[PDB]
Symmetry: C3
Subunit: 363 residues, 3 copies
Amino acid sequence: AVADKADNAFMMICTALVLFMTIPGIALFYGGLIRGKNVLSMLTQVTVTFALVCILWVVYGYSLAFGEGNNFFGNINWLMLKNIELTAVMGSIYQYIHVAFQGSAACITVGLIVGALAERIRFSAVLIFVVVWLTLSYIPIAHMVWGGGLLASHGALDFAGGTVVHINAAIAGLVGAYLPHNLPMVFTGTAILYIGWFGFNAGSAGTANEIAALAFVNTVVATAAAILGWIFGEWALRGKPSLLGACSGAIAGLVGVTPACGYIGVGGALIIGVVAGLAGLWGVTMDPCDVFGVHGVCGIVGCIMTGIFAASSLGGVGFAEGVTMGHQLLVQLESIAITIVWSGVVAFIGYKLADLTVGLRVP
Amino acid sequence: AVADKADNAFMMICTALVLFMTIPGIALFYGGLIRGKNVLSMLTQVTVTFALVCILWVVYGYSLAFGEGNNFFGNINWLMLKNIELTAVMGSIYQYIHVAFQGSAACITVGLIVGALAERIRFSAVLIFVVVWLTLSYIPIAHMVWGGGLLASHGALDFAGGTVVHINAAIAGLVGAYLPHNLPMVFTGTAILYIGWFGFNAGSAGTANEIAALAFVNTVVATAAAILGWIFGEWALRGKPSLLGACSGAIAGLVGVTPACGYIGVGGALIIGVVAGLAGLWGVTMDPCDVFGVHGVCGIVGCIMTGIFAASSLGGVGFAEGVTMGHQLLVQLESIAITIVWSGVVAFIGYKLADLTVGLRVP
Amino acid sequence: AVADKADNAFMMICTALVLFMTIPGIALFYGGLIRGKNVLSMLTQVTVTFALVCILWVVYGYSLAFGEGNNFFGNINWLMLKNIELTAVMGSIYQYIHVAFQGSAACITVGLIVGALAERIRFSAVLIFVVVWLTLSYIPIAHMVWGGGLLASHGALDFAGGTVVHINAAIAGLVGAYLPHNLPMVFTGTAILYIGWFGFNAGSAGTANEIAALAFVNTVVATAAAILGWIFGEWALRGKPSLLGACSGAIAGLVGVTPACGYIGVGGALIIGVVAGLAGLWGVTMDPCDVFGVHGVCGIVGCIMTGIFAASSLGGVGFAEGVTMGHQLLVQLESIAITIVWSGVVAFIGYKLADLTVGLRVP
Ligand SMILES: CCCCCCCCCCCC[N+](C)(C)[O-]
Ligand SMILES: CCCCCCCCCCCC[N+](C)(C)[O-]
Ligand SMILES: CCCCCCCCCCCC[N+](C)(C)[O-]
């Protein structure tokens, strides 16, 4: 295996773009939504926990997520990236770039939860939770889906983190919840997330090829379909579009297309944006800062609709051989369930530990 | 034709950077200029119409702009990108990346007009206009200049959208006009536009080659020459530089260099920044948020000065064989006129239709 | 020598990212720190002096920095980049891209000083200073370190500007000093600097290779180690972390890792973030907007700790042959001293000239 420099370049810029989604994307997104008295604190918890996620990733996270192991977790053979030679290639890029790319995804996922709960959760409790849930939920699920684990070895399609990122975080966010002051800033964070999101979606191809290209366009497309789906729905229900309505729409589409971008046709992308846009709207019409209402609802949707629109018939890249659409759909449904239930338990364990240790508070 | 992954990578990042110019670049630029009571609305119209432009592009825009057709428009053979195979190569990159790159340019152009008129134009009227003018002005002109059409087939030089983007939008903006509350935010939008602008200028080479490199440097250069041209002029006239004066200067240079970046020497870039900077200043001294004063004036200027500084004599890449500077200059002048008059008629038709349909308003 | 397009692409995006650090990164960073009545002015001086640095670079800066010359400065043979053929290759990329990359570094360095002193220094005095100090300090030191000069030809390790950028600017900032209103904005500027910083650190490899990959990861790593080092230290001393404490932490790590990113192991990166984080904290506990407290202190630290962690023993890329760690450490110490004293004299000459010309003021 030899590293292609074009792929190195692409994937290093993609990692930067995903890094950009957390710092400052998600921070500015929540920063404009939450009460003003809470913004600095929230900004601090996103920053400190990003730092944290970065460190646990390098120390053992990556090895556990992407080390060869069982169906559920990797190994502790790549502790602080050792026995990864500098010139070790994975795919068509240096493994170090995989390490950095994959860590940036862990980061935005944690950032999605931490920003939602920075208000109500006590700092030390968030840190405890983050450590628990990254280790026992993000990493194992990462392994199961992208790391050769249970779900991958069963044929699950999730190009860019419909389960790993979105459903996973949405359920974490809900268990927590269970247990807008600056719209310009909200828009900026949305804009930065959207731009950074191409690093995540396109870079999930691991190379600058026809598939990254496909992921890219499907992302422009489904983000736009969703925006208009939301906006029209909002104009139907509420009489007029709103800025927050437009930004939520975009996220609904970005979320919905996340599992699907690498597998579907643009026709399929557009239909996905549309449906995710409206389901997002319906979702928030029926949970901290609507974490689930958009990420949970839309993630489930994207994941299901991937096992439809991958069909070569519907302009998709085609299912694996011997895989009927019906089998793929069951496998999607299974992946979703396994993610919902797994992130749930772990979330509950995280929040409970934090609570029995420092208390969820705040004081 | 085989896709070069380095070019795929480059052009996918360039598209992201051009996407960044609209979301949130232009939005934040106007967001700080216009009255506060109008910002959210403007932010919403830029977002919703971006979504729209994205969708019309995928549906028929691209096929009409870059399909093989006549002198003026392409075909409806690539409706929803069909009969474009995934691995179809155009230039040295996948065609899908051309689709995404070219759509991001349509987006920033519409964003330039929509932001300027979000205040005074009624939403549904903007949408109607956008549809009319994208279809009948942006697309045909795109085709004429970059799509094998009338102006290209006559030797016009316009590397990165002096006519297609700037003059085109400036005239749209003027017909409309005919028919600063947050300078920090203005600066941020300027900064984001400038950074994103390298995707547009350098990526217009279609490859990561000596010409992209040339476009890049000419962009650093002419943006700086212009800033100082404006600033000094402002210090001469007004007694001191201003932040808005500095940001306008930058845009004057970015606009002025847009047609020229791929064809000229750095000596030529600097002279272009200087002249565009002062003409921009003179321009706004003598029209919504000075859309024309800078884009129209400076676009015309860049376009004219391209047919001078392309000269191999003046450090440029040289004119095509058999093309004297005098012939190039006439061809520039013709391209400008054709753009001014074409965008005018279409603009007028767009605004008139909107007016007879929903009314330009606002209520 | 033949240009690799993957490297062209990578380095053109890296330059964009470094450009992003100044416009708007550093501007927004200082913009939120300094008094509100001073923000627009500061924003204007960063913009105008960036423009300036861009122009002097193209005119003679690059030729003086990277032209073949003596130990201390290059030549005036590349005035306005002439006798640099368009297709001239340097390393594995077009020379034009080196020109643009290296100029973007000059820009962020000047931006670091100008933002710090925009308040207290008179405009014309800043301009005079900038011209003096860029020409006589930034350029010669650039030449000495990255341009084949005294320090390089003695084996100094400074991957990405520990002396050239950080110590150099910190001493300029101190001589000047000798002679927070918006924390959300501070965070945004920090975020943008951090993201842009990967262009500087990774792009300093000149290619998208295992070393750029190494630089990248070491950057994620040391920024995170530092954030937590600062944060814990701040929690130890002040009872709780703060947003500004978190952002300063990040910068401490980014600065500290700057010389080292291309030479060390991730184990070494983490230790560097930790130590730089605390030394930054200790630094500001014991100078405009703590320019030295973080850049001077942390730069010195990174530079020293590079001559330790480069050791192949400590997971580093190894010292040059015949170079013991002890010899490298002396060479680091010498590089630092030469930089501290050189930037000092020149700074003093710059400020003194400005003072005798227009007066440091402000009026
Ligand atoms: C592959 C993409 C991974 C990105 C993770 C999430 C980023 C978008 C977050 C937007 C938050 C919107 N909201 C309020 C519905 O949660
Ligand atoms: C190839 C570049 C295409 C970019 C289109 C326009 C972006 C810059 C817009 C700045 C608006 C400045 N103003 C007020 C003079 O219109
Ligand atoms: C290789 C990196 C070159 C970047 C130059 C400096 C950028 C960071 C500036 C942050 C300023 C922080 N502060 C207040 C301590 O000066």
